[PDB]
Write an enzyme that holds these catalytic residues in place. Sequence first.
Site, PDB file in Angstrom:
ATOM      1  N   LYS A   1     155.787  22.283 -64.837  1.00 43.14           N
ATOM      2  CA  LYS A   1     156.572  21.297 -64.065  1.00 43.14           C
ATOM      3  C   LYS A   1     158.055  21.669 -64.036  1.00 43.14           C
ATOM      4  O   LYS A   1     158.670  21.701 -62.976  1.00 43.14           O
ATOM      5  CB  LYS A   1     156.383  19.880 -64.638  1.00 43.14           C
ATOM      6  CG  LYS A   1     154.908  19.464 -64.701  1.00 43.14           C
ATOM      7  CD  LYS A   1     154.667  17.995 -65.068  1.00 43.14           C
ATOM      8  CE  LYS A   1     155.050  17.678 -66.505  1.00 43.14           C
ATOM      9  NZ  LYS A   1     154.256  18.492 -67.462  1.00 43.14           N
ATOM     10  N   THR A   2     158.610  21.941 -65.212  1.00 44.90           N
ATOM     11  CA  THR A   2     159.999  22.337 -65.355  1.00 44.90           C
ATOM     12  C   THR A   2     160.230  23.637 -64.573  1.00 44.90           C
ATOM     13  O   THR A   2     161.225  23.794 -63.857  1.00 44.90           O
ATOM     14  CB  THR A   2     160.333  22.566 -66.832  1.00 44.90           C
ATOM     15  OG1 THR A   2     160.299  21.309 -67.524  1.00 44.90           O
ATOM     16  CG2 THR A   2     161.702  23.263 -66.988  1.00 44.90           C
TER      17      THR A   2
ATOM     18  N   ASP B   1     163.262  14.978 -66.257  1.00 45.77           N
ATOM     19  CA  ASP B   1     162.016  15.132 -66.994  1.00 45.77           C
ATOM     20  C   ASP B   1     161.716  13.798 -67.674  1.00 45.77           C
ATOM     21  O   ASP B   1     162.644  13.045 -67.998  1.00 45.77           O
ATOM     22  CB  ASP B   1     162.167  16.249 -68.033  1.00 45.77           C
ATOM     23  CG  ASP B   1     160.844  16.631 -68.663  1.00 45.77           C
ATOM     24  OD1 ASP B   1     159.828  16.648 -67.947  1.00 45.77           O
ATOM     25  OD2 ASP B   1     160.839  16.936 -69.875  1.00 45.77           O
TER      26      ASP B   1
ATOM     27  N   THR C   1     154.063  13.226 -67.453  1.00 41.94           N
ATOM     28  CA  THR C   1     152.744  13.645 -67.928  1.00 41.94           C
ATOM     29  C   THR C   1     151.655  13.025 -67.055  1.00 41.94           C
ATOM     30  O   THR C   1     150.564  13.594 -66.910  1.00 41.94           O
ATOM     31  CB  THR C   1     152.524  13.200 -69.378  1.00 41.94           C
ATOM     32  OG1 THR C   1     152.787  11.800 -69.476  1.00 41.94           O
ATOM     33  CG2 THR C   1     153.443  13.955 -70.312  1.00 41.94           C
TER      34      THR C   1
ATOM     35  N   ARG D   1     151.911  27.503 -71.481  1.00 42.17           N
ATOM     36  CA  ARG D   1     152.773  27.481 -72.659  1.00 42.17           C
ATOM     37  C   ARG D   1     151.992  27.899 -73.912  1.00 42.17           C
ATOM     38  O   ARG D   1     152.470  28.711 -74.706  1.00 42.17           O
ATOM     39  CB  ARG D   1     153.374  26.085 -72.850  1.00 42.17           C
ATOM     40  CG  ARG D   1     154.266  25.918 -74.079  1.00 42.17           C
ATOM     41  CD  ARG D   1     154.769  24.473 -74.218  1.00 42.17           C
ATOM     42  NE  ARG D   1     155.807  24.129 -73.249  1.00 42.17           N
ATOM     43  CZ  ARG D   1     156.266  22.894 -73.049  1.00 42.17           C
ATOM     44  NH1 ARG D   1     155.780  21.876 -73.748  1.00 42.17           N
ATOM     45  NH2 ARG D   1     157.224  22.673 -72.153  1.00 42.17           N
TER      46      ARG D   1
HETATM   47  N1  LIG Z   1     152.046  29.374 -63.350  1.00 40.83           N
HETATM   48  C1  LIG Z   1     152.673  29.935 -64.416  1.00 40.83           C
HETATM   49  N2  LIG Z   1     152.730  31.349 -64.557  1.00 40.83           N
HETATM   50  C2  LIG Z   1     153.374  31.906 -65.670  1.00 40.83           C
HETATM   51  N3  LIG Z   1     153.975  31.174 -66.677  1.00 40.83           N
HETATM   52  C3  LIG Z   1     153.903  29.774 -66.497  1.00 40.83           C
HETATM   53  C4  LIG Z   1     153.296  29.084 -65.439  1.00 40.83           C
HETATM   54  N4  LIG Z   1     153.414  27.743 -65.585  1.00 40.83           N
HETATM   55  C5  LIG Z   1     154.032  27.605 -66.654  1.00 40.83           C
HETATM   56  N5  LIG Z   1     154.362  28.767 -67.271  1.00 40.83           N
HETATM   57  C6  LIG Z   1     155.018  28.985 -68.465  1.00 40.83           C
HETATM   58  O1  LIG Z   1     154.870  28.156 -69.494  1.00 40.83           O
HETATM   59  C7  LIG Z   1     155.971  27.658 -70.168  1.00 40.83           C
HETATM   60  C8  LIG Z   1     155.862  26.300 -69.923  1.00 40.83           C
HETATM   61  O2  LIG Z   1     156.344  25.722 -68.738  1.00 40.83           O
HETATM   62  P1  LIG Z   1     157.204  24.485 -68.296  1.00 40.83           P
HETATM   63  O3  LIG Z   1     157.634  24.617 -66.867  1.00 40.83           O
HETATM   64  O4  LIG Z   1     158.334  24.298 -69.237  1.00 40.83           O
HETATM   65  O5  LIG Z   1     156.176  23.237 -68.519  1.00 40.83           O
HETATM   66  P2  LIG Z   1     156.233  21.708 -68.327  1.00 40.83           P
HETATM   67  O6  LIG Z   1     157.622  21.290 -67.768  1.00 40.83           O
HETATM   68  O7  LIG Z   1     155.102  21.340 -67.462  1.00 40.83           O
HETATM   69  O8  LIG Z   1     156.104  21.205 -69.777  1.00 40.83           O
HETATM   70  C9  LIG Z   1     157.077  28.363 -69.350  1.00 40.83           C
HETATM   71  O9  LIG Z   1     157.468  29.288 -70.361  1.00 40.83           O
HETATM   72  C10 LIG Z   1     156.589  29.173 -68.288  1.00 40.83           C
HETATM   73  O10 LIG Z   1     157.521  30.237 -68.034  1.00 40.83           O
END
Ligand SMILES: Nc1ncnc2c1ncn2[C@@H]1O[C@H](COP(=O)(O)OP(=O)(O)O)[C@@H](O)[C@H]1O
Length: 298
Positions: A48-49, A93, A127, A186
Amino acid sequence: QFLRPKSLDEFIGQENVKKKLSLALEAAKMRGEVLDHVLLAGPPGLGKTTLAHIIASELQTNIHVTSGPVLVKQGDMAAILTSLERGDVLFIDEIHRLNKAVEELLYSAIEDFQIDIQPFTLVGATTRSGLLSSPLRSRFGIILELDFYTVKELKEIIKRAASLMDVEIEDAAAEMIAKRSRGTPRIAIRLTKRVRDMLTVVKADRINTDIVLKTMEVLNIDDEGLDEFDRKILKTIIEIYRGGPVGLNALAASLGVEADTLSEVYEPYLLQAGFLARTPRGRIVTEKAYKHLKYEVP
Ligand SMILES: Nc1ncnc2c1ncn2[C@@H]1O[C@H](COP(=O)(O)OP(=O)(O)O)[C@@H](O)[C@H]1O
Ligand SMILES: [Co+2]
């Protein structure tokens, strides 16, 4: 941050989300218009981030990162809103954690675009989209629901990660890690980094199945990818609540953790993987749970 996708072309998986987002993004860029508000929903570590930053990068505008629980008084929200430049992305977030104070303020800046606020794109992350207030949720013109990734997708993310960390890995080994990543990028990347540590200490030329198994044993991760706390949740329901049904608050109190950390962070994959089920009277463990943890089926 060198492992974080910088564009949709580097974002593996989430085909449905990508095509929807790409459509809205490309059109906005071509017309030079401010992108409609976007809501990103799904369990942690799904990207998401990452998507919020990709959105700002493609629109070639600045991104302002903040959190719901961080913005308490209207003053904090006002300062951020007034710092936004036309087309900027306001990323909030845990947006569902916004108090009525700053919430109503943010709501107003969306309709009248005045608190004089420059037109901007609100990108929220949660979430569960169901956690947002009814009013605010109807403000997002684009809702992207992210679900867990497939083993194949995670395997690709793992191979990509290894390459970026200057380490070789056999397909079979990448498959094994992906199967234990609980559908989350992650988690998959963290496991890959830990397996890299094993390869280092054992002095191997490339990550193989043997090295992966050795690492999984040190990390206490089983063949289903469940960790110590996942097993603790299931074992508590099994031993203390005779398999359930047990209410969320009751289970949380017994585990000594917030109900949110349970239903938003750990339960999602357990439900998806078929270890847990939800009923009107409470959470219950399934036969798959008893068999996996080697408990005599009642
Ligand atoms: N589609 C994807 N391909 C490669 N890495 C991803 C992907 N989605 C998430 N990640 C990786 O996983 C980690 C988690 O992502 P993040 O955007 O912070 O998650 P969320 O905000 O949903 O908790 C990041 O390090 C990211 O670079
Ligand atoms: Co309840």
